[PDB]
Amino acid sequence: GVFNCETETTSVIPAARLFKAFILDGDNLFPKVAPQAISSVENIEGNGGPGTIKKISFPEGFPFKYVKDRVDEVDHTNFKYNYSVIEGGPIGDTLEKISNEIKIVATPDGGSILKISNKYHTKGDHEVKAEQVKASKEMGETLLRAVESYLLAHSDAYN
Amino acid sequence: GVFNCETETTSVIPAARLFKAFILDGDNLFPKVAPQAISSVENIEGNGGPGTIKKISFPEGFPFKYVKDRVDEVDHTNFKYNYSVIEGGPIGDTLEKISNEIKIVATPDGGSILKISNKYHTKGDHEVKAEQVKASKEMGETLLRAVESYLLAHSDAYN
């Protein structure tokens, strides 16, 4: 089956700056701001753009050890990041892939919203494990808030 | 905020027949085949077509007492049913409405899939309550199970 979750999350950080930090420099920034959540990010194949395979490792004590993501598209004009979760983490049993999009949209107040879509491909009749959707939400919100906190403390970062 | 949940549910019933029973005659069918889930369905305005407002009442001890739904569109050829939850139930606090789109599509084995989209308009930063996502999912499953079972027991119905 196919299951799609589209969510919106508010950030006080302006869209362009958040896109630079959260998306463009995620590999370097995530282990810096959220070391307790992300151990490392490394490129398995490629540089960082379309086709690139990256391994994101988590610290011991988490439900998962790692995920492999494939970079699908990085739209700098529309602040849009498309990627797929293709190995590790929740991939296994009845879940084959998660196809993700993160779009960072400026808001009238000078802040931003992250428009996030997670498209799950499950085996035939099977449904998405509810604990994964929830844990994915927690991991994402954790990273965002850690990025936010860093940016607010470092006005010179990602100008 | 805006939150969208899109799900697929498999049915053993052919698309045309499921549409006729589950969608076109649900008002009549649901309280008869699933009285433990739906107590009554009454039109306030119209007769089931676009613009119809209907009150759906739930059994005692269900978290909610009723919802009002507005019928948005009914496509008899393409098996589409669009409707909005506008009052009662989960509507209140930080949720203004749920816009729903149902599409019934044939499968090669002679059965069908219900593609369901539930779009939640929440207040500002507030997230959709996961309990409503669960309740919407479980209500759908319950009603489909009851309708399928009825149709399988009555081969002359809606054929």
UniProtKB/Swiss-Prot annotation, chains A, B:
Molecular function, one GO term: abscisic acid binding
Keyword Ribonucleoprotein: no
Impact upon substituting residue 47 to S: Slightly reduced interaction with BV16
Impact when changing residue 45 to S: Strongly reduced interaction with BV16, hypoallergenic
GO BP annotation list: abscisic acid-activated signaling pathway; defense response
The organism's place on the tree of life at top rank: Eukaryota
Chief localisation class: cytoplasm
Variant or mutagenesis effect after changing residue 108 to G: Slightly reduced interaction with BV16
Keywords recorded for this protein, A-Z: Allergen, Cytoplasm, Pathogenesis-related protein, Plant defense
One GO CC term on file: cytoplasm
The keyword ATP-binding is annotated on this UniProt entry: no
Localisation per UniProt entry: Cytoplasm
Bilayer-spanning residue ranges: none
Matching Gene3D superfamilies: 3.30.530.20
Binding site for brassinolide: 54, 81, 83, 100
InterPro entries linked: Bet_v_I/MLP (IPR000916), Bet_v_I_allergen (IPR024949), Plant_def-hormone_signal (IPR050279), START-like_dom_sf (IPR023393)
Family named by the database record: Belongs to the BetVI family.
Protein task: May be a general steroid carrier protein.
Protein name: Major pollen allergen Bet v 1-A
Source organism per UniProt: Betula pendula
Gene that encodes the chain: BETVIA
